[PDB]
Symmetry: D2
Subunit: 77 residues, 4 copies
């Protein structure tokens, strides 16, 4: 699978998890929690993209310029 | 107050809120939720920096290169 | 217009921006890895098969200055993107 | 060494890196607004009082290439920073 970031973004908006081929650390993906999600979660939030890093920790995802322009996005399956 | 980002970071690590002078939108600050904070919040998380944007919404903060090197950081008081 | 659409416009060499941005006269422009090899190559850019610089996205940050653009989560998920006339 | 310490080292013209980084031979280096005005100024950089480029932080991303560095939240809050020998 060779998706762009924009295509990988609509996949995130529909509740699925995406990852990149040329990423260094493994078992790594992104997931998007909506405001209502984050609200029922904790009580106003905006949409927040997270990342399950290699250490099984959840951090706020920071898009690198490479990740934004990359074409190697795939869906977790 | 003219703090660097590193000094503004230790202020975030002690549970205080920081902001920049040369920021465009107003009523804007950062705050840091720890893992244990985010855990008692919702159940493993890492440290996550947030930002109360101008629209009173909480987003995951993305550091611009300007914000990182800036010297106009101040504490909310 | 979403960010994914603004990306394809950026990769085609045009300037994009967000209406929801605070600043005025701000826009993103992309300098591809091959474009930088030509601008810094002195007519030898076509022969460089592995340029040093990767792709760099720039932003003219209202102050008539140019910085390297850091894509915020708000910009990535935004739908207020538009092309500079 | 924290990120704030790595910043002052970066502003002084030395290369920093994180041991917790996956990639090898990766390091950040800072190109100040005045440094870029000299390198692209042809001996006229000293007379430029308002350079076009702001400060740009770069990263040599293991592939022997250079990109504009996007500071992740992990790097910002990290304490595994170190100076390149």
């Amino acid at each position: 699978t060779k998706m762009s970031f924009g295509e990988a973004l609509e996949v995130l908006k529909q509740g699925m998890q995406v990852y990149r081929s040329g990423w260094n650390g493994k078992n790594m993906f992104l997931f998007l929690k909506s405001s209502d999600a984050l609200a029922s979660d904790f009580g106003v939030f905006g949409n927040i993209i997270f990342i399950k890093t290699a250490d099984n920790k959840i951090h706020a995802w920071v898009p690198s310029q490479t990740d934004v322009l990359a074409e190697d996005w795939d869906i977790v399956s």
